[PDB]
Every structure is written in structure tokens, then in C-alpha cells.
Design a protein around this ligand. Structure first.
Ligand code: BCL
Ligand code: BCL
Ligand code: BCL
Ligand SMILES: CC[C@H]1c2cc3[nH]c4c(c3C)C(=O)[C@H](C(=O)OC)c4c3nc(cc4[nH]c(cc(n2)[C@@H]1C)c(C(C)=O)c4C)[C@@H](C)[C@@H]3CCC(=O)OC/C=C(\C)CCC[C@H](C)CCC[C@H](C)CCCC(C)C
Ligand SMILES: CC[C@H]1c2cc3[nH]c4c(c3C)C(=O)[C@H](C(=O)OC)c4c3nc(cc4[nH]c(cc(n2)[C@@H]1C)c(C(C)=O)c4C)[C@@H](C)[C@@H]3CCC(=O)OC/C=C(\C)CCC[C@H](C)CCC[C@H](C)CCCC(C)C
Ligand SMILES: COC1=C(OC)C(=O)C(C/C=C(\C)CC/C=C(\C)CC/C=C(\C)CC/C=C(\C)CC/C=C(\C)CC/C=C(\C)CC/C=C(\C)CC/C=C(\C)CC/C=C(\C)CCC=C(C)C)=C(C)C1=O
Ligand SMILES: COC(C)(C)C(=O)C/C=C(\C)CC/C=C(\C)CC/C=C(\C)CCCC/C(C)=C/CC[C@H](C)CC/C=C(\C)CCC=C(C)C
Ligand SMILES: CCCCCCCC/C=C/CCCCCCCC(=O)OC[C@@H](O)COP(=O)(O)O
Ligand SMILES: CCCCCCCC/C=C/CCCCCCCC(=O)OC[C@@H](O)COP(=O)(O)O
Ligand SMILES: CCCCCCCC/C=C\CCCCCCCC(=O)OC[C@H](O)CO
Ligand SMILES: CCCCCCCCCCCC[N+](C)(C)[O-]
Ligand SMILES: CCCCCCCCCCCC[N+](C)(C)[O-]
Ligand SMILES: CCCCCCCCCCCC[N+](C)(C)[O-]
Ligand SMILES: CCCCCCCCCCCC[N+](C)(C)[O-]
Ligand SMILES: CCCCCCCCCCCC[N+](C)(C)[O-]
Ligand SMILES: CCCCCCCCCCCC[N+](C)(C)[O-]
Ligand SMILES: [Fe+3]
Lengths: 242, 303, 281
């Protein structure tokens, strides 16, 4: 009536309830405790406790991160509460593209470049990566870059490539006024004669944030560049036709 | 329409990573082979180098002896005829000794002795390979998760041909070496034991197998959708959370009320997959050892 | 309530229908127009199941079961108790499932991410529809669909499979199982690989993607890479469910014998089918 097989399956469901509870607390190491829409801690936090802290040791002497810890956005958030009660949207109080909110948001990451295994810059533009070149598909360097209004914004002058992983992560585009911005690889459609970008119209390339160096990008600069560009999908909608 | 990040658009080559530094004993490393344009359209294009230590030579040799032992036997059933060999490749079978032979090794070659010899070669190939997965990680300073996850598969395998047959009294309970016959063995095993759908550890095994497809479809789609924020560089997103990890988590929070962290999702993933063979091996091990009829056993205890 | 980093993301916009009338949250859940459709279909469809439970006469959850109309009913509609519940619930389920996918598309848009997730979910919806709508319609009866019960729906699988001998011999079923097992192999390695880099041997710094790629090249001579593994995982799971629908949709519509007879197209080929010996000689 109470088998060993019977004992095994009751045991397993008990292990399972403990495994799920363990797994859930492990995924509460970012973002928790939950907050009310005014930034103060919410009363009802769920029935799983916060996890005891753990520590990663960054290579090449870059410090130790410990999660969970005190969370700070570390930047001004340009949005207004619109509602007496909770649960409603929050209004951009500015240029949400320039202010970095909504689908245009970025994160206050360390203002350094990602570092590969031997400690070198992880992303370098081809002009400075000792050894690299193009090997298949249409080579975009030289090609004109075109936005969602169907006007041109400049030309590809380089490719920023992943040194250890050997892939292209950015196009470097030169603007009508002669400066340059980085285009994320994922956000472009390379073709036989051009390079097309639905994210932005020609006139919003000038607002892609700019780098403090011509052969290194930083993690904080990568977040600003990419958040801006994807935010164009919503915020550059008036330009977009067809 | 929009770029989908399913196939790489432009491919770039540099010097290949020889992977200096760390503790890998480069005496057992090969050179680096060709690169593949074909492979580069979907993933990396670097082929090799491979690490071939003493433990990997052992694995690879007894691995081939397993394959060749079944091959000879397959040719012998073809009467050494090349045309028959092809006509019946999926129908041949190398089989364990008859039930009368017990747990004995006296069985003559043509009546199961060969099956014991192949299974010894298999046994060595899989285990020395498991030592490889622990040592290659050890060399690079990594964690042992790959070895431990491998241990879940070896469990089910070990139960099928070795632990359950021993506890049963005869090698004839073990699995044959053939394409269609191992399928036939599987269908009969469920019949002999009164419908494996009613083995609750088989039902768990299926929930985790379906869930592994659910989980991997969510996680792949989710990382491809935040790749535009460099979301596939997950270790840095663990070191320094970016907008990629935050957009990903908020999609799931907004959709089903909870969500993961860039690290934590890989814990879910390793456990989902591992529990397929953990619960599977248990289900098989109790079949016929402790329960002969699962459907009947089901009625007496719950459903 | 909110994740600590969440607020800057809750901006207006992205809806496909309704404008800002459903553009708000309830707890963690985004609502949107299709989060209201999702609620109607799913609630009603639940009310039909509870009602089906008093008819059958039990509030035991394990035991409740809802069957399609009998084969004799064909494709026409059935009395509510003689099959119509299943028939409506099916509409309710299809409604909720598709509404959920379009809710995911709104969410992708307000967050400005790709539309990968609800696209992958649509394969799940189409395997479902293959079983309850496509295959039953192509054969002529709702009765070829499966019953909605924890334990009954398992017996339908067994009855259906054994109608064609050992269903293992369905070649599409072979390819799909091959994708299903390979998916779980890849899901296990990818979890163990990334967790071995972020959680390395004691007394060591965090590993880098350099080491992920070194580990697999040591191990098997090739590494698909951090973007390949995620592409690969999606492709594995989605092709497994594709050949699932493929293996079920040809069974009993264009193929009717024991599935093992399919393999004679190779064994009975005339220029080796008469040879002495082997298995088939
Ligand atoms: C795929 C081909 C077959 C099939 C073959 C099998 C086999 C074989 C088995 C199951 C088993 C299960 N199947 Mg079934 N099953 C199919 C169709 C379905 C559908 C559906 C709407 O199409 C659903 C919801 C289910 C659901 C389930 C669960 C009862 C159980 C665990 C699966 C799991 O973890 O999945 C992965 C999903 C997750 C991990 C996420 C959580 C899923 C939750 C648990 C599903 C909730 C079901 C709920 C009780 C029913 C809907 C109720 C409404 C809420 C009102 N099956 C079709 C008919 N299914 C197993 C079992 O133990 O059965 C008794 C089993 O052995
Ligand atoms: C008619 C047939 C019976 C049946 C009989 C069985 C039997 C018998 C078994 C299963 C088992 C399984 N069943 Mg059942 N099953 C049926 C119907 C189903 C249905 C369905 C929709 O109807 C489903 C979804 C399943 C699902 C499953 C899986 C969850 C499970 C196997 C997991 C796995 O990853 O194995 C694949 C993985 C392995 C075998 C491990 C491999 C590890 C080793 C080390 C690999 C070595 C490789 C070697 C070296 C090869 C060389 C390769 C080269 C070197 C490259 N069954 C019916 C009821 N089922 C298993 C189980 O555990 O049940 C409890 C099992 O043994
Ligand atoms: C004894 C029976 C026969 C046999 C007969 C059958 C039959 C008959 C069928 C299969 C099918 C399948 N079999 Mg077979 N099969 C056998 C042996 C096996 C073995 C084995 C090791 O022996 C394996 C691995 C498999 C494997 C499989 C897969 C290829 C496939 C099941 C997955 C699928 O289609 O998912 C598809 C996924 C879904 C349908 C999920 C849909 C989910 C939807 C969109 C949402 C639900 C959400 C839910 C309601 C939400 C609830 C609330 C939440 C909890 C909040 N079979 C034996 C020989 N097999 C099935 C198939 O191919 O179907 C197409 C099928 O019908
Ligand atoms: C957690 C459960 C899942 C799982 C996990 C898993 N498997 C694993 C691992 C993990 C975590 C490993 O670390 C390990 C590995 O190294 O993966 C890359 C492994 C592994 N899983 C394997 C297979 C496998 N896993 C399976 C299943 C599963 N693995 C589960 C779904 C299955 C099935 C039936 O579903 C199989 C077949 C291996 C690829 C590998 C272990 C390798 C090994 O032990 O090799 C020893 C044998 C040899 C080195 C060589 C033998 C000779 C060969 C027969 C080839 C001969 C070829 C001949 C010369 C030419 C012709 C061939 C023809 C086809 C043309
Ligand atoms: C295609 C690859 C895999 C996949 C993909 C996939 N599924 C997904 C997603 C993706 C990418 C989602 O985005 C979505 C999600 O939100 O996940 C958290 C979903 C999801 N996959 C789910 C389940 C599920 N997926 C499964 C399968 C898989 N889904 C595939 C293997 C299975 C099975 C049996 O293998 C199950 C059980 C949910 C967790 C979720 C879908 C949630 C949803 O659509 O919710 C809205 C609807 C409701 C809350 C209820 C509607 C209820 C009906 C009106 C009444 C009940 C009817 C039903 C027919 C009864 C079933 C009886 C059973 C006893 C058989
Ligand atoms: C890197 O990135 C990633 C993350 O982020 C960092 C992630 O989180 C995730 C997500 C992964 C996880 C959280 C791991 C756990 C996931 C599973 C185990 C898969 C199974 C999931 C479930 C069983 C949860 C099911 C819950 C569902 C389907 C929704 C629950 C439904 C309700 C309670 C009500 C439905 C809500 C409605 C109708 C909204 C409308 C509201 C009105 C009031 C109207 C992934 C994939 C990811 O890769
Ligand atoms: C060209 O032809 C030549 C001859 C060159 C070839 O090489 C052709 C080769 C082939 C045609 C190969 C064909 C191979 C197959 C069809 C193999 C298919 C295999 C399977 C379906 C495997 C199914 C599962 C088998 C299992 C579960 C085996 C279990 C192994 C045991 C756990 C090991 C136990 C050890 C024992 C009993 C020995 C005891 C000794 C100890 C030291 C413990
Ligand atoms: C409602 C809850 C009910 C609970 C009922 C009792 C449960 C009993 C326990 C179940 C076991 C669950 C935990 C299993 C996971 C163990 C975590 C683990 O593995 O810890 C060591 C880990 O660091 C090593 O890996 P890394 O962190 O990567 O080094
Ligand atoms: C009654 C029979 C039950 C089953 C018998 C045993 C079967 C084989 C067991 C396999 C378990 C799977 C591997 C463990 C889970 C995955 C590992 C994990 O999540 O963390 C591993 C962790 O520690 C890291 O170790 P270190 O690198 O040494 O710190
Ligand atoms: C000279 C050497 C000859 C080599 C011959 C080539 C063999 C191909 C085998 C497997 C490739 C598929 C690998 C898929 C499983 C990998 C799972 C994984 O962890 O991927 C992450 C990635 O490896 C890092 O980011
Ligand atoms: C069965 C697989 C899914 C298990 C669900 C685990 C619990 C999810 C709820 C966690 C709590 C969410 N919350 C409120 C803290 O945000
Ligand atoms: C699992 C291995 C799959 C590798 C096959 C890759 C197919 C080649 C795709 C070429 C892509 C061409 N294009 C225009 C998208 O760049
Ligand atoms: C030192 C090894 C030399 C590298 C050899 C390069 C191979 C040619 C690359 C083209 C790829 C061909 N293909 C179709 C397999 O992709
Ligand atoms: C080094 C090979 C390991 C041998 C393990 C398998 C034993 C095989 C038994 C075959 C029977 C031989 N004999 C003499 C009884 O006919
Ligand atoms: C790590 C993921 C945890 C998800 C939990 C999945 C629970 C599914 C239960 C299916 C029940 C099978 N059975 C035969 C015991 O009834
Ligand atoms: C075991 C299968 C059932 C899985 C149910 C999914 C868990 C419910 C998730 C909702 C959690 C959100 N909530 C209510 C905590 O805020
Ligand atoms: Fe990942």
C-alpha cells in the first residue's frame, strides 16, 4: 500500500518544491525588493525571501560585484507620474530619445570597455585590430547608409569587430558634417548597394551619442548608443511612411 | 523587412584563437583546421583545434572498438554480402544472451558473448569521456557544471544496460545494438510493464522534456530579441546589468507576472534538461524491480 | 509593484488596438486590448469546464474530462453535453491562445525589442490547431481530436499511436524525436557552459566568452559561439514542433497502414529484394 516506488514519488515532489523555491530566489538577485511607483518599498513582496548575497570577482582587476545589494538607477529619469493610483504609464518630460526613457532607455554601466581573455579591448574597429578583414557576404565599407525617411545620412567608414568572438558588432558611419557614430549590427539590413536602417531617419543619426575615443567604446557608451537607436522604432514613427 | 539576426550578414576573420594562458597542456592540442563559410552563416566558423589527451585517446579507441564490433557482427549477418549489408542496415541487431544465461559471461560469442564485448567497449568509451568533460573544464579554471549535467545522461544509460539488468538477474533485460530493434525493445518494455504512461516518473520525464523545448524556445527568442543591445554577451550582462537584461526580464514580468535574471535563467535551463534523465532513470529502475504493472499500481495509490 | 529598474520603461505607446484605453498595468501584468480579450476567452472557457464538471458530477480535478462529439457527428455542431462544450471551449482556447500572442507583440513594441518570442509561440499554437482543427477537419470528424482531461488525454495518444502499429516507425516522428532529444542535450550544455564561466573554480576570477569557446573546442573540436547557441536552441525546439505537426497531419489522411510498411520502399527494391540471406531474405 505504501511502496518504495510510492516513497520515491512523494520524495521527488518534495525535492521539486524545494528546487523551485531555490531557483526563484536565485532570480531575485536583480531588481528586488519590489518598489511602489514612488520608489519606496512595496509592502506585498511575494512569499519568497530575498537571497543571501553572493560575489563575482571581475577579471583583470576590475573589482567585485555583489548581488543583491543597494540598487540605484544612477541617472536622472525624465518621466512624470500621471496617476493617483498605481498601474498607469509615466509621461516623458522632454525628448525621450535624448533623455533616455521608454524604448530609448539605457543603463548606467561602468564607463570602461569590455575586456577579452588576455585583457585587451574586446571591441576594436578594423582600422586598429591587428589582423582582421572581411570574409563573406557584401562588404559594407563605402556603402551609403539610409534611414526610414529614405534619405542618406553618411557612409560606412569602418567595422567595429569582436576580437575574441570574431564577429561584427558595429558599423562606423561618417556624417555630413564629418564626425562619426556607431551603428549596431542587429539594427541594419546590409544590401547590394546601400545599408538600410528602419530605426531612424537620416536626420536622427546626428543624435546617436558620441564616444570619448576613436578606437575604443565603453559599456556605458554601448548602452547609450543601442537604447537610442531602438527607441527610434517608436519615437521616429512620424517620419516613417509606406 | 527588418533584420532578424538569424543568419550572419557579414563575416569577419582574424588570427585564430590558439587559447594560450591558463593551464591547458598544449602538448595534447592539435593545430587549427579550416574555417567554414557554411558554418559562419549561422555560428562561428573556426574549426579546431581539439584537445586529444591520453583520456581522449582511450575514449576514442574503445569507442571505435564498440562501433567496429557491432559492424563485424552486422557484416556477418549480411553473410559478408555488400548488397545485403545496405539492404538491411537498419534491421541488423547485436543482442544480449538468452534469459537462461543469467548474469554469466560464459555465453558463447554468437549467443550474446559479442554483446558483452561491445558493451565493455561502450562502458569504457563513455566513462573515460566523462573524465574528459571534467578535466577540460578543470584545465581552463571553469566550473564543473558540464560534467555534472553529463552525469544525468550516464545515469539513464547505466540503468538501461547495466543496473536494471543486474538487479533483474540476466543480461537479456538489457538493450540491443540496432536501429529498429532498440525501438522494438522500447515498445515492448512498456507492454511488459503495464503502460509506461502510468509510471509517474515517465510523466515527469515528459513534462521536463516538453518544458525543455518550451524553455529553450523562450530563451533563444528572448536573447535574439535583445541582441540589438548586445544581449548575447551574457557574462558581462551578469557582471554589469545592461538594458538588454532589463528589457528581457520586463517582457516576461509584463507577460506572466514574474521573470528571471541574466544568470538565473541558466539555472532554470540546466535543471529543466537534467531532470529529464534523472526522473527517467528512476522510472526505469523501479520497473520490474519493484513494480511489474504501472497501471495496476496506479489504481492502488492515488491515480 | 515594480522592479527597481522598471519605472523608466512604463511609457505610453505600442498598442495595436485601443490606443491608450487599455494601456496600463495590473500588478506586474500589462493589460492592453488583447489582455482583455485574453481574459474573456479564458474566463468563459473556464466557466464551461466547471459546468461540464457538475454535468459529469464531480468537483474532483483529476477526474474531469471534456470529449469531442462522436465520429458519427462528423464536422457538424453537437448538443452542448453531447460534444458542444468541447467545441466551444476549443474556440475559447484558440481565442485565448492567439490573443496572448498579440498581447506579446504589443509588449515587444513598448519595449522596442524584436518580435521573436510571439513568433516562436505561434508554432505551439499551430501544433495545437493541427490536432484539434486541421487533422480532424481533413479526416471528417471533431471526434479525431483529443479529450481535455489529465488522464483521458494520455489514453487518446496511446489509442491513436497503436492504431498504426508501433508509431515509432512514423519517419516524421523519428525526425521530431531527434530534434527533441538534441534540444535537451543543447539546453543542458548551454546552461552548464555559461554557469561554468560565471561560477568558475574556487579562487578564480569570472571567466570570459573566450573560455566558453575554448572549452568546446577542447571538448569536441568546434564551438558554435554565443550567438550560434541561442540561434541553435531556437531552431532545435521550433523544428521539433514542426515535424510533430507534420507527423500527425499525414497519419490517417494520406497514410493508413502500419507505419513499419513504409520502410519496404527500401527493402523490397527489386535489385536487392531477391538476394538470399540477411534479415529480409
Ligand atoms: C503533445 C502531444 C499530446 C500530449 C501528450 C502528453 C503526454 C504523453 C504527457 C502529457 C502530460 C501533460 N500534459 Mg499533455 N499532450 C498534449 C496536449 C496538452 C495541452 C494542450 C492545450 O494542447 C496541455 C495544456 C497539456 C498539459 C499537460 C499536463 C497535464 C502534463 C504536463 C505537461 C508539461 O509539463 O508541459 C510543458 C509545460 C510546462 C512545464 C508549463 C506548465 C504547464 C501546465 C502544468 C499545464 C497546465 C494544464 C492544466 C491543468 C490544463 C489546462 C487547464 C486550464 C488551466 C483551465 N497537454 C497533446 C494531446 N501530455 C504528462 C502527464 O503527466 O500527463 C498526465 C504526460 O506524460
Ligand atoms: C510504446 C513506447 C512507450 C514508451 C516507452 C519508453 C521507454 C522504454 C523509455 C521511455 C523513456 C522516455 N520517454 Mg516514453 N514511451 C512511450 C511514449 C512516450 C511519449 C509520447 C508522446 O507518446 C513521449 C513524449 C515519451 C517520452 C520519453 C522521454 C521523456 C524519455 C527519454 C528521455 C531521453 O532523453 O532519452 C534519451 C537519452 C538517453 C538514452 C541517454 C544517453 C546517454 C549516453 C551516455 C549517450 C551515449 C551515446 C553513445 C556514445 C552514442 C555514440 C554517439 C557518437 C559518439 C556521436 N514517451 C510509450 C508509452 N519511454 C525512458 C525513460 O526514462 O522512461 C522512464 C525509457 O527508457
Ligand atoms: C504509445 C503512443 C505512441 C506514440 C504516439 C504519438 C501520437 C499519436 C502523437 C505523438 C506525438 C509526439 N510524440 Mg510520439 N508516440 C510514441 C512514442 C514516443 C516517444 C518515446 C521515447 O517512446 C517520444 C520521445 C515521442 C515523442 C513525441 C513528439 C514528437 C510529439 C509530442 C510533442 C508535440 O507534438 O508537442 C506539440 C506541442 C503542443 C501541442 C503544445 C501546445 C500548447 C498550447 C499552444 C498552449 C497550452 C497552454 C495551456 C492551455 C496554458 C494552461 C495554463 C498555464 C499553466 C498557465 N513519442 C508511442 C509509440 N506520439 C504527438 C504529435 O506529434 O502531435 C503533433 C501526437 O499527437
Ligand atoms: C541531460 C540529458 C541529455 C543529455 C546530456 C548530455 N549528453 C552529453 C553531455 C551532456 C550534458 C556531455 O557533456 C557529452 C558531450 O561531450 O557533449 C558534447 C554528452 C554526449 N551525449 C552524447 C549522445 C547522446 N545524448 C543523448 C541524450 C541526452 N544527453 C539527454 C537528452 C542521446 C540520445 C539517445 O538522446 C545521445 C545519442 C554524445 C554525443 C556525448 C558523449 C560522447 C561519448 O561518450 O563518446 C564516446 C564514443 C566515442 C568518442 C566514439 C565512438 C565511435 C562513434 C560510434 C562514431 C564512429 C563513426 C565512424 C568511424 C564513421 C561513421 C558514422 C556514420 C553515421 C556515418
Ligand atoms: C513551440 C515550442 C514550445 C512552446 C513555445 C512557447 N509556448 C509559450 C511561449 C512559447 C515561445 C510563450 O510565449 C507562452 C508563454 O507565455 O510562456 C510563459 C507559451 C505558453 N506555453 C504554455 C504551455 C504549454 N506549452 C507547451 C509546448 C510548447 N510551447 C512547445 C514545446 C505545452 C506542452 C503540452 O508541450 C504546454 C502545456 C503556457 C505556459 C503558455 C501559454 C499561456 C497562454 O497562452 O495563456 C492564455 C490562456 C490561458 C491562461 C488559458 C486558456 C484556457 C482554455 C480557454 C480552457 C482550457 C483549454 C485547454 C485545451 C485544456 C487542456 C487539457 C489538458 C489536461 C490536456
Ligand atoms: C535572459 O532573459 C530571460 C529572462 O529575463 C532575464 C526571463 O525572464 C525569461 C523567462 C524565464 C523564466 C522566468 C524561467 C521560468 C519559466 C518556466 C518554468 C516556463 C514555464 C512558465 C510557467 C509555467 C508560468 C505560467 C504562467 C502563465 C502562462 C501566465 C500566468 C497567467 C495568469 C496568472 C493570468 C494571466 C494574465 C492576464 C490574462 C493579463 C490580463 C490582465 C487583466 C486584469 C485583464 C527568459 C526565457 C529569458 O530568456
Ligand atoms: C563499414 O562497416 C564497418 C564494420 C567498418 C563498421 O564499422 C560499420 C558499423 C556499424 C554499422 C555500426 C552500427 C551501430 C549501431 C546500429 C548502434 C546503435 C546503438 C543503439 C541503438 C544503442 C542503444 C542503447 C544501448 C545501451 C543502453 C547500452 C548499455 C551499455 C552498458 C551500460 C555497458 C555495460 C557493460 C557490460 C555489460 C560489460 C561488463 C563489463 C564491465 C567492465 C562492467
Ligand atoms: C515550498 C518549499 C518546500 C521545500 C521542501 C523541502 C525542500 C528540500 C530541498 C530541496 C533541494 C533544493 C535545492 C537544490 C539546488 C542546490 C543548489 C546548489 O547546487 O548549491 C551549490 C551551488 O552553489 C554550486 O553551484 P554554483 O553556485 O554554480 O557553484
Ligand atoms: C535514486 C537515484 C537518483 C539519481 C542518481 C544520480 C543520477 C546522476 C545525477 C545527476 C545530477 C545532475 C547534476 C547536478 C545538477 C547540475 C549542477 C549544478 O546546478 O551545479 C553544479 C555545482 O555543484 C557546481 O560544482 P563545482 O563546479 O564543483 O562547484
Ligand atoms: C579539428 C576538429 C574537428 C571538429 C569537427 C566539428 C564537430 C561539430 C560538433 C558539434 C558542434 C555543435 C555544438 C552545439 C552544442 C554547443 C552547446 C553550447 O554550449 O554552445 C555555446 C557555444 O559553444 C559557446 O558560446
Ligand atoms: C512551475 C514553473 C514556474 C514556477 C513559478 C515560480 C513562482 C513564480 C512567482 C514568483 C514571485 C513573483 N514576485 C511576486 C516576487 O514578483
Ligand atoms: C546547422 C547548420 C546550418 C548552416 C547552414 C547555413 C545556410 C547558409 C545561409 C546563407 C545566408 C545568406 N545571407 C544572404 C542571409 O547572408
Ligand atoms: C590552416 C587552415 C587553412 C584554412 C582553410 C580555409 C578553408 C576554406 C574556407 C571556405 C569554406 C568552405 N566551406 C564550404 C566548407 O564552407
Ligand atoms: C577485454 C575485453 C573484456 C571482456 C569482457 C566481456 C567478456 C566476454 C565473454 C565472451 C565469451 C568468451 N567465451 C570464451 C566464454 O566464449
Ligand atoms: C524546473 C521546472 C519545474 C516545473 C514543474 C513541472 C510539473 C509538471 C508535473 C506533471 C505531473 C506528472 N505526474 C505523472 C507525476 O503526474
Ligand atoms: C505548476 C504549473 C502551474 C504554473 C503557474 C504559473 C505561476 C503563476 C505566476 C503568477 C505569479 C505572479 N504573481 C501572482 C505572483 O504576482
Ligand atoms: Fe543564454
Amino acid at each position: 500500500n505504501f511502496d518504495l516506488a510510492s516513497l520515491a514519488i512523494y520524495s521527488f515532489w518534495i525535492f521539486l518544491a524545494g528546487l523551485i523555491y531555490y531557483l526563484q530566489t536565485e532570480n531575485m538577485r536583480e531588481g528586488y525588493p519590489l518598489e511602489n511607483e514612488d520608489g519606496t518599498p512595496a509592502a506585498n513582496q511575494g512569499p519568497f525571501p530575498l537571497p543571501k548575497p553572493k560575489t563575482f570577482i571581475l577579471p583583470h582587476g576590475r573589482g567585485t560585484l555583489t548581488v543583491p545589494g543597494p540598487e540605484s538607477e544612477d541617472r536622472p529619469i525624465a518621466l512624470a507620474r500621471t496617476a493617483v493610483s498605481e498601474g498607469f504609464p509615466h509621461a516623458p518630460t522632454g525628448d525621450p530619445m535624448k533623455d533616455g526613457v521608454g524604448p530609448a532607455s539605457w543603463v548606467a554601466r561602468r564607463d570602461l570597455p569590455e575586456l577579452d581573455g588576455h585583457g585587451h579591448n574586446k571591441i576594436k574597429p578594423m582600422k586598429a585590430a591587428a589582423g582582421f578583414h572581411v570574409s563573406a557576404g557584401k562588404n559594407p565599407i563605402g556603402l551609403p547608409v539610409r534611414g526610414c525617411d529614405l534619405e542618406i545620412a553618411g557612409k560606412v567608414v569602418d567595422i567595429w569587430v569582436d576580437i575574441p568572438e570574431q564577429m561584427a558588432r558595429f558599423l562606423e558611419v561618417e556624417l555630413k558634417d564629418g564626425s562619426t557614430r556607431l551603428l549596431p549590427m542587429q539594427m541594419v539590413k546590409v544590401q547590394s548597394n546601400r545599408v538600410h536602417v528602419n530605426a531612424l531617419s537620416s536626420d536622427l543619426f546626428a543624435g546617436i551619442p558620441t564616444i570619448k575615443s576613436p578606437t575604443e567604446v565603453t559599456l556605458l557608451e554601448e548602452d547609450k548608443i543601442c537604447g537610442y537607436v531602438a527607441g527610434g522604432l517608436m519615437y521616429a514613427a512620424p517620419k516613417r511612411k509606406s | 523587412a527588418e533584420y532578424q539576426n538569424i543568419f550572419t550578414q557579414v563575416q569577419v576573420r582574424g588570427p585564430a584563437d590558439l587559447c594560450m594562458t591558463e593551464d591547458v597542456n598544449l602538448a595534447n592540442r592539435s593545430g587549427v583546421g579550416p574555417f567554414s563559410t557554411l558554418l559562419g552563416w549561422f555560428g562561428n566558423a573556426q574549426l579546431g583545434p581539439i584537445y586529444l589527451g591520453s583520456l581522449g585517446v582511450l575514449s576514442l579507441f574503445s569507442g571505435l572498438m564498440w562501433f567496429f564490433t557491432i559492424g563485424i557482427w552486422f557484416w556477418y549477418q549480411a553473410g559478408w554480402n555488400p548488397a545485403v549489408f545496405l539492404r538491411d542496415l537498419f534491421f541488423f541487431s547485436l543482442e544480449p544472451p538468452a534469459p537462461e544465461y543469467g548474469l554469466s559471461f560464459a555465453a558463447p560469442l554468437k549467443e550474446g558473448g559479442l554483446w558483452l564485448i561491445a558493451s565493455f567497449f561502450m562502458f569504457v568509451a563513455v566513462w573515460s569521456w566523462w573524465g574528459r568533460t571534467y578535466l577540460r573544464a578543470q584545465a581552463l579554471g571553469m566550473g564543473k557544471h558540464t560534467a555534472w549535467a553529463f552525469l544525468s545522461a550516464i545515469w539513464l544509460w547505466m540503468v538501461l544496460g547495466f543496473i536494471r539488468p543486474i538487479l533483474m538477474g540476466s543480461w537479456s533485460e538489457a538493450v540491443p545494438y540496432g536501429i529498429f530493434s532498440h525501438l522494438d525493445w522500447t515498445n515492448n518494455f512498456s507492454l511488459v510493464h503495464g503502460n509506461l504512461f502510468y509510471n509517474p516518473f515517465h510523466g515527469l520525464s515528459i513534462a521536463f522534456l516538453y518544458g525543455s523545448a518550451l524553455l529553450f524556445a523562450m530563451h533563444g527568442a528572448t536573447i535574439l530579441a535583445v541582441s540589438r543591445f548586445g544581449g548575447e554577451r551574457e557574462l558581462e550582462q551578469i557582471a554589469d546589468r545592461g538594458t538588454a537584461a532589463e528589457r528581457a526580464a520586463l517582457f516576461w514580468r509584463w507577460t506572466m507576472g514574474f521573470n528571471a535574471t541574466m544568470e538565473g535563467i541558466h539555472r532554470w535551463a540546466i535543471w529543466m534538461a537534467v531532470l529529464v534523465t534523472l526522473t527517467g532513470g528512476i522510472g526505469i529502475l523501479l520497473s520490474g524491480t519493484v513494480v511489474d504493472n504501472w497501471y495496476v499500481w496506479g489504481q492502488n495509490h492515488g491515480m | 509593484a515594480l522592479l527597481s529598474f522598471e519605472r523608466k520603461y512604463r511609457v505610453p505607446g505600442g498598442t495595436l488596438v485601443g490606443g491608450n484605453l487599455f494601456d496600463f498595468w495590473v500588478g506586474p501584468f500589462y493589460v492592453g486590448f488583447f489582455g482583455v480579450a485574453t481574459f474573456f476567452f479564458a474566463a468563459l472557457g473556464i466557466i464551461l469546464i466547471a459546468w461540464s464538471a457538475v454535468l459529469q458530477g464531480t468537483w474532483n480535478p483529476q477526474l474531469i474530462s471534456v470529449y469531442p462529439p462522436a465520429l458519427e457527428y462528423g464536422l457538424g455542431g453537437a448538443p452542448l453535453a453531447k460534444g458542444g462544450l468541447w467545441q466551444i471551449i476549443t474556440i475559447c482556447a484558440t481565442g485565448a491562445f492567439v490573443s496572448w500572442a498579440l498581447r506579446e507583440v504589443e509588449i515587444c513594441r513598448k519595449l522596442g525589442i524584436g518580435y521573436h518570442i510571439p513568433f516562436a509561440f505561434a508554432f505551439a499554437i499551430l501544433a495545437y490547431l493541427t490536432l484539434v482543427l486541421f487533422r480532424p477537419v481533413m479526416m471528417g470528424a471533431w471526434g479525431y481530436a483529443f479529450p481535455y482531461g489529465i488522464w483521458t488525454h494520455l489514453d487518446w495518444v496511446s489509442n491513436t499511436g497503436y492504431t498504426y502499429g508501433n508509431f515509432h516507425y512514423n519517419p516524421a516522428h523519428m525526425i521530431a524525436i531527434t530534434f527533441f532529444f538534441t534540444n535537451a542535450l543543447a539546453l543542458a550544455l548551454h546552461g552548464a557552459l555559461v554557469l561554468s564561466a560565471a561560477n568558475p573554480e574556487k579562487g578564480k576570477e569570472m571567466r570570459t566568452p573566450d573560455h566558453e569557446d575554448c572549452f568546446f573546442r577542447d571538448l569536441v573540436g568546434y564551438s558554435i559561439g554565443t550567438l550560434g547557441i541561442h540561434r541553435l536552441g531556437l531552431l532545435l525546439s521550433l523544428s521539433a514542433v514542426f515535424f510533430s505537426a507534420l507527423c500527425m497531419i499525414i497519419t490517417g489522411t494520406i497514410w493508413f497502414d502500419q507505419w513499419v510498411d513504409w520502410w519496404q520502399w527500401w527493402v523490397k527494391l527489386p535489385w536487392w529484394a531477391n538476394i538470399p540471406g540477411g534479415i529480409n531474405g
